[PDB]
Design a protein around this ligand. Structure first.
Ligand SMILES: Cc1cc2nc3c(=O)[nH]c(=O)nc-3n(C[C@H](O)[C@H](O)[C@H](O)COP(=O)(O)OP(=O)(O)OC[C@H]3O[C@@H](n4cnc5c(N)ncnc54)[C@H](O)[C@@H]3O)c2cc1C
Length: 148
């Protein structure tokens, strides 16, 4: 039962924040909303997607209604059914654990993970996740950049 900020999210402000961060642990280069990206809420149950760019929806074949409010791990199965803590049968366990720990620590991370589109099409996702600070100054969200 994820809640969404009425009035939307400051996606542009966050992209600006990310490109201006002082100690980047991963180079991303210039980024904008023309690419596949998602913002998840670190402070809500199971760090749910609260925003997805059209590029992301087009890439994965899923609609807004189908991704919002869910933890993005569903992409790890061709049937979009992935329970938390479960042992994936098509994805590297170490990879999933790497994402998990980085996110838990607000640490930037970049990985290549196997994902599946809504029609079951397998693909390699070059994923980068960067923690984002909201108006309070503390990390509240995480922005993911997906690349096929
Ligand atoms: C902004 C954002 C964008 C994201 N975008 C994507 C995306 O496009 N595609 C995608 O696939 N994911 C994406 N993710 C990742 C996904 O939402 C989860 O964060 C990720 O799957 C790891 O968390 P989890 O809760 O699924 O971990 P878990 O369900 O807990 O799974 C961890 C797995 O690692 C193994 N494991 C755990 N600990 C150890 C250990 N000590 N030794 C060995 N094995 C271990 C387990 O067997 C387990 O199956 C994104 C996350 C964020 C925050």
């Amino acid at each position: 039962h994820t809640l969404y900020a009425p009035g939307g999210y400051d996606i542009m402000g966050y992209l600006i924040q990310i490109m201006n961060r002082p100690n980047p642990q991963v180079e991303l280069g210039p980024v904008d909303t023309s690419s596949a990206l998602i913002l998840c809420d670190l402070k809500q149950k199971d760090t749910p997607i609260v925003y997805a760019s059209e590029a992301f929806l087009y890439m994965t074949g899923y609609s807004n209604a189908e991704v919002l409010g869910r933890n993005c791990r569903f992409l790890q199965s061709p049937d979009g059914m992935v329970k938390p803590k479960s042992t994936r049968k098509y994805v590297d366990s170490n990879t999933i654990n790497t994402m998990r720990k980085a996110i838990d620590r607000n640490a930037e991370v970049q990985v290549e993970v196997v994902n599946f589109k809504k029609n079951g099409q397998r693909f390699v996702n070059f994923l980068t996740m960067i923690p984002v600070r909201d108006e309070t100054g503390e990390y509240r969200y995480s922005m993911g950049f997906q690349c096929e």
